[PDB]
C-alpha cells in the first residue's frame, strides 16, 4: 500500500546517513560572555561546598552507627597537621571566595524568579555588583 511502503523505504536510506553525521563543536569555540561564566561558577561553588558538607557529616554520622566517638576537637586537631601552613591558607583562601560568590549569587537568583531585573541591562549590572561584592566579603573572611 503506497504512502506506507513509501515511508519505510525512506527511513532506511535516511537512518543510514543520519548515523554518519558529526556534531558541531559547542564548547571551546563559543565566546566567553558574562551571562554564562558567572552562572557556571554558581554551580561549581555549590558542588565543592556541598561536597564538604556531606563529607564532614557522614564522617560524624558513621561514628554514631559504628561507635567511634568523634568530637569537634578530635577532628579539628587532625586537620591542623598533615598540611603545611601555606597549604592551609590555600584551602582557607579558596573556600572563602567560593562562599562569597555563592552568597551573593543566591540573592541574584532570588530577584530573578520574581521576574525582576531580567532584561539585558539588569543582567549586566547585577553581575558587576556580584563580582565586586565577592572581592569585599571574600577578603573580609580572611582577616577574621
Amino acid at each position: 500500500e503506497m504512502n506506507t511502503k513509501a515511508a519505510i523505504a525512506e527511513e532506511q536510506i535516511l537512518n543510514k546517513q543520519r548515523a554518519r553525521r558529526p556534531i558541531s563543536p559547542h564548547l571551546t569555540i563559543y565566546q566567553p560572555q558574562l551571562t554564562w561564566y558567572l552562572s557556571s561558577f554558581h554551580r561549581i561553588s555549590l558542588v565543592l561546598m556541598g561536597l564538604g558538607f556531606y563529607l564532614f557529616t557522614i564522617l560524624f554520622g558513621v561514628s554514631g552507627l559504628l561507635g567511634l566517638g568523634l568530637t569537634t576537637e578530635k577532628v579539628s586537631n587532625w586537620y591542623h597537621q598533615k598540611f603545611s601552613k601555606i597549604t592551609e591558607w590555600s584551602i582557607k583562601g579558596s573556600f572563602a571566595y567560593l562562599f562569597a560568590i555563592h552568597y551573593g549569587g543566591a540573592i541574584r537568583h532570588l530577584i530573578w524568579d520574581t521576574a525582576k531585573e531580567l532584561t539585558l541591562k539588569g543582567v549586566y549590572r547585577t553581575g558587576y555588583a556580584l563580582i565586586g561584592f565577592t572581592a569585599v566579603l571574600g577578603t573580609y573572611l580572611l582577616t577574621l
Binding site: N3, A6, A9, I13, Q17
Partner: protein, 593 residues
C-alpha cells in the same frame, strides 16, 4: 541509475508561501489527502518580507462600500484587468480578513476592539471622486510576517503532509493532462514521483532574472518554467513592476507606507515632486507614474547623489511616535545596508524591480488555461490549477495597486480549495501509467550534474542579469528591445557548455543553482520577446516610440510558448474579459483616461 520512490495523493501543492499554505488546509479540512511540497521551510518564504497591509472594505474607520474598492482596482490597472476577477476578489474581501483574524493573526487594534486600518496610495472613496480612504487592515510592519506564522500554525491543526526542502523538477503529463510532479529531495538525494489528481502551483514570481531586485535569493521562476516546459503558455509576461523606492546598490525595500503617512521625494534642489517636470498634481500615485517620474529625473540633469543616480525620501518631518509604533522595522533595515537613521537624514532611494504580473493564465476559480490552436478560444488544462504570484488571473493587469497582492493569496488560494471539492470525490483509484514516467527529467538532472565545460553557472547568471537591466527597463524603445531579444538569445546558446564542480547528491547546492538558472532563462527570454511586440504604452510598460494607450487594437493579453532553452518563442493573443459575474450587483466600468 537512481532509485525513485512513488507516492499517491489526492491533491499536491507546490509551494509553502502565503498562497500555497492557504490552499493546503483548505483541502485538508474538506477531507482530502494533500501534500505541500516546498523548497524552503514554510515560514522562510518571500511573503515573510512584506511590510504592508491586506485591503478590506470592513469600514471601521468610516463608511465603506466594497464597490468603491473595485473601482480603484480596475482604474489603476489601465482597464486590462479581468472584471470578473476584480468582482470576486473585492466582494469576498471583508469575509476573508475577519476569518483571517479568527485564526489568530494579531492585528493592530482601535479604541473599541476593531482592526486598525491606514492609507496606502491608489485607493480613494466615492468612486474615484473623493478623499483618500483607509482600507489596509494591517499589523504594524510585520503584516507578511504575521501572515505566514499564523497560516502555518493553522496548517498544523489539520493533517497536511508537508514535504519540506524538496526541489520540484518538472510536471508529469499524459496526453494533454497532468497527473503530478517529480521532486528531488535535498537531504538524502532521492527522486520522488508524486502522483496526483489535481496539482496546484504557488511557486511565486521571478525577480532574480534582473540585476538588482527586491525579490529574495530563492525567488526565481520555478513554476512558470515547469508549465512552459510542458507545452502550455504563459500570459502577460511583459508587465514587470519597478518600485519607486529601493536601497542603492543591494536592493532592499523600504515600505510603501513610508510615503503613506508623511513622505517627501527630495531631489538635488530639495522640492516636493508635485509638478514642473514629471508628475501629476497628486503625490503618492501608482508605481508606474511615480517610478517613471524618478528614472527621468536623474537622466535630464537633476542629479542628486554621488554618481548622479540617487534620490532622497524625507522622514525628519514626522514625529518620533510614528517611527516606533506604526513602523519600527524600517528604522532598523535602513541603518544597516545604508548606514543612516530615519529621524534626521534622508535614506538612499533607487528604482528596482518589485513585482511580476505575468504567469500561468488562470480562470477566476483557479483552473489553469490554454487555447485551442485552430479556433483561438479558451480551454482548461485537466488536473492543473494555480494561485498566488505564479498565476496571472489578471486581477492586477498592467499595474498592481499597493497591498492588493496579499489579498490575492488569501482569496484566490481559498477559491482553489472550493472548486476541487465541488469537482472531485475524495479518493478514487489512479490510472495505470508506464514505468518510465518522468524519464526526461532524470536525464536533464543527469546532464547538468556531470557538467564539463568552460563557463561556470555564476558566469552565465551575470550575462543574463546585466542584459535585462540594460534593455528591458523602465524606458524602452524598439531599438534597444530588438537588441535585448538578440542578446538574451546569445546567452541561452552558451548554457549548453555550463560547468559544474560538485558531483554529489546530498545537498548539491551547485546543481540547484544551475537548475534555478535553466528555470530563469525560460522566463527571461519570453519577457524580452513579448515586450518587443506591444506597440503601445499602458501600465508599467512604457514605449518612447509609441507613447499612447491603444484601447482599440491592444486590449489583449499575450501568450508565450517555449518548449526548452534555445527554442523559438511564438506569440498568440486572447481577449480580455470586460463583464463581471453578476451585472445586477455592480455594473462593469467603461474605459476612460
Amino acid at each position: 541509475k537512481y532509485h525513485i520512490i512513488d507516492h499517491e495523493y489526492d491533491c499536491v501543492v507546490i509551494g509553502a508561501g502565503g498562497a500555497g499554505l492557504r490552499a493546503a488546509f483548505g483541502l485538508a479540512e474538506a477531507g482530502y489527502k494533500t501534500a505541500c511540497i516546498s523548497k524552503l521551510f514554510p515560514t522562510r518564504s518571500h511573503t515573510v518580507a512584506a511590510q504592508g497591509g491586506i485591503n478590506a472594505a470592513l469600514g471601521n474607520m468610516h463608511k465603506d462600500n466594497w464597490k468603491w474598492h473595485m473601482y480603484d482596482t480596475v482604474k489603476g490597472s489601465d482597464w486590462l484587468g479581468d472584471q470578473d476577477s476584480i468582482h470576486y476578489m473585492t466582494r469576498e474581501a471583508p469575509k476573508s480578513i475577519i476569518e483571517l483574524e479568527h485564526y489568530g493573526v494579531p492585528f493592530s487594534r482601535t479604541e473599541n476592539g476593531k482592526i486598525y486600518q491606514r492609507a496606502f496610495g491608489g485607493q480613494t472613496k466615492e468612486y474615484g471622486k473623493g478623499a483618500q480612504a483607509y482600507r489596509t487592515c494591517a499589523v504594524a510592519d510585520r503584516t507578511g510576517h504575521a501572515l505566514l506564522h499564523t497560516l502555518y500554525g493553522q496548517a498544523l491543526r489539520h493533517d497536511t503532509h508537508f514535504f519540506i526542502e524538496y526541489f520540484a523538477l518538472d510536471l508529469l503529463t499524459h496526453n494533454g493532462e497532468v497527473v503530478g510532479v517529480i521532486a528531488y529531495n535535498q537531504e538524502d538525494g532521492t527522486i520522488h514521483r508524486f502522483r496526483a489528481h489535481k496539482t496546484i502551483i504557488a511557486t511565486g514570481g521571478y525577480g532574480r532574472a534582473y540585476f538588482s531586485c527586491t525579490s529574495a535569493h530563492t525567488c526565481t521562476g520555478d513554476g512558470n518554467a515547469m508549465v512552459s516546459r510542458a507545452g502550455f503558455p504563459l500570459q502577460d509576461l511583459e508587465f514587470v513592476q519597478f518600485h519607486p523606492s529601493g536601497i542603492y546598490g543591494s536592493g532592499c525595500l523600504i515600505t510603501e507606507g513610508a510615503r503613506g503617512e508623511g513622505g517627501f521625494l527630495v531631489n538635488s534642489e530639495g522640492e516636493r515632486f508635485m509638478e514642473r517636470y514629471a508628475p501629476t498634481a497628486k503625490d503618492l500615485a501608482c508605481r508606474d507614474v511615480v517610478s517613471r517620474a524618478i528614472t527621468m529625473e536623474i537622466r535630464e540633469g537633476r542629479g542628486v547623489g554621488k554618481k548622479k543616480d540617487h534620490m532622497y525620501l524625507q522622514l525628519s518631518h514626522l514625529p518620533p511616535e510614528v517611527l516606533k509604533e506604526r513602523l519600527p522595522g524600517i528604522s532598523e533595515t535602513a541603518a544597516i545596508f545604508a548606514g543612516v537613521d530615519v529621524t534626521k537624514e534622508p535614506i538612499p532611494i533607487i528604482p528596482t524591480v518589485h513585482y511580476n504580473m505575468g504567469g500561468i493564465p488562470t480562470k477566476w476559480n483557479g483552473e489553469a488555461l490554454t487555447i485551442d490552436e485552430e479556433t483561438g478560444e479558451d480551454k482548461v488544462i485537466p488536473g492543473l490549477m494555480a494561485c498566488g504570484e505564479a498565476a496571472c488571473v489578471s486581477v492586477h493587469g498592467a499595474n498592481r495597486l499597493g497591498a492588493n497582492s496579499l489579498l490575492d493569496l488569501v482569496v484566490f488560494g481559498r477559491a482553489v480549495a472550493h472548486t476541487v471539492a465541488d469537482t472531485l470525490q475524495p479518493g478514487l483509484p489512479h490510472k495505470p501509467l508506464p514505468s518510465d514516467l518522468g524519464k526526461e527529467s532524470i536525464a536533464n538532472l543527469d546532464k547538468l550534474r556531470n557538467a564539463n565545460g568552460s563557463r561556470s553557472t555564476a558566469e552565465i547568471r551575470m550575462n543574463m542579469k546585466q542584459t535585462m537591466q540594460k534593455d528591458v527597463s523602465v524606458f524602452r524603445t524598439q531599438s534597444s528591445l530588438d537588441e535585448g531579444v538578440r542578446n538574451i538569445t546569445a546567452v541561452e546558446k552558451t548554457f549548453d557548455d555550463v560547468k559544474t564542480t560538485d558531483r554529489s547528491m546530498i545537498w548539491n547546492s551547485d546543481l540547484v543553482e544551475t537548475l534555478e538558472l535553466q528555470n530563469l532563462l525560460t522566463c527571461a527570454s519570453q519577457t524580452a520577446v513579448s515586450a518587443a511586440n506591444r506597440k503601445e504604452s499602458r501600465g508599467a510598460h512604457a514605449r518612447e516610440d509609441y507613447p499612447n494607450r491603444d484601447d482599440e487594437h491592444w486590449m489583449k493579453h499575450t501568450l508565450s510558448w517555449q518548449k526548452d532553452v534555445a527554442a523559438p518563442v511564438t506569440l498568440k493573443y486572447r481577449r480580455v474579459i470586460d463583464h463581471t459575474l453578476d451585472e445586477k450587483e455592480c455594473p462593469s466600468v467603461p474605459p476612460t483616461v
